[PDB]
């Protein structure tokens, strides 16, 4: 079972540290436990979440080496994916909630009523499946990097460089999963499915385009859709 090379430990350090630096509050301790009149009150709290994703991506050298036109396509592509992952890994089986932003504990119904629709059940089912995965800050950060560095995104210029970065993250990630020896079977094939699970959530980005009026939505929410 191949384990991380020294160069992968450095990439792992870089990606884990950029994640924890840009992840809102151990500090469950700050949790809340709380129609366009609920969409409005939700979209209001997305603007800090979008910024954190940009901040994570900026704290990743390989991304800072891409032209800003590629940086923008890549960020519009992975924001919802990363926010959804960051919320699903903060699933409490007891309260049956996800924790949004710093700590606003939302329910499947509340998030459905916030305009996510079927994407609520999607992230809730993801969170429930991710409990037995026991993903540490390193594993969450490397998922975010695999999602972020996607060349299948329309309008990209450096498709070849981006696929390289992703193959790096993907291999460093598998080697860490090898080192980590989770008690779940087919763990690596099972994560590639949760990447698909995550990617499908961010492919429903028109399910906004249909549920558009526009000035009733935060500007950063409109820039990534």
């Amino acid at each position: 079972k191949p384990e991380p090379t020294d160069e992968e430990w450095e990439l792992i350090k870089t990606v884990t540290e950029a994640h924890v630096a840009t992840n809102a509050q151990s500090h469950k301790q700050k949790r809340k436990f709380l129609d366009l009149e609920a969409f409005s009150h939700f979209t209001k709290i997305i603007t800090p979440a979008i910024t954190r994703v940009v901040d994570f991506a900026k704290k990743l050298p390989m991304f800072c080496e891409l032209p800003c036109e590629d940086q923008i396509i890549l960020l519009k592509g992975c924001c919802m994916e990363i926010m959804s992952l960051r919320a699903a890994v903060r699933y409490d089986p007891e309260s049956e909630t996800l924790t949004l932003n710093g700590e606003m504990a939302v329910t499947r119904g509340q998030l459905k009523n916030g305009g996510l629709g079927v994407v609520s059940d999607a992230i809730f089912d993801l969170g429930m499946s991710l409990s037995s995965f026991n993903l540490d800050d390193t594993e969450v950060a490397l998922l975010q990097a695999v999602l972020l560095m996607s060349s299948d995104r329309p309008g990209l210029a450096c498709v070849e460089r981006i696929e390289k970065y992703q193959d790096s993250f993907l291999l460093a990630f598998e080697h860490y999963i090898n080192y980590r020896k989770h008690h779940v079977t087919h763990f690596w094939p099972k994560l590639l499915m949760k990447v698909t699970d995550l990617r499908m959530i961010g492919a429903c980005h028109a399910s906004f385009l249909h549920m558009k009026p526009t000035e009733l939505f935060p500007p950063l929410f409109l820039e990534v859709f």
């Binding site: 910024t51 940009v54 800003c68 940086q71 960020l75 820039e223």
Partner: peptide, 11 residues
């Protein structure tokens, strides 16, 4: 326009 996104990205 991604004007605020450029702003955020280009410091």
């Amino acid at each position: 326009e991604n004007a605020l996104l450029r702003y955020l990205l280009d410091k």
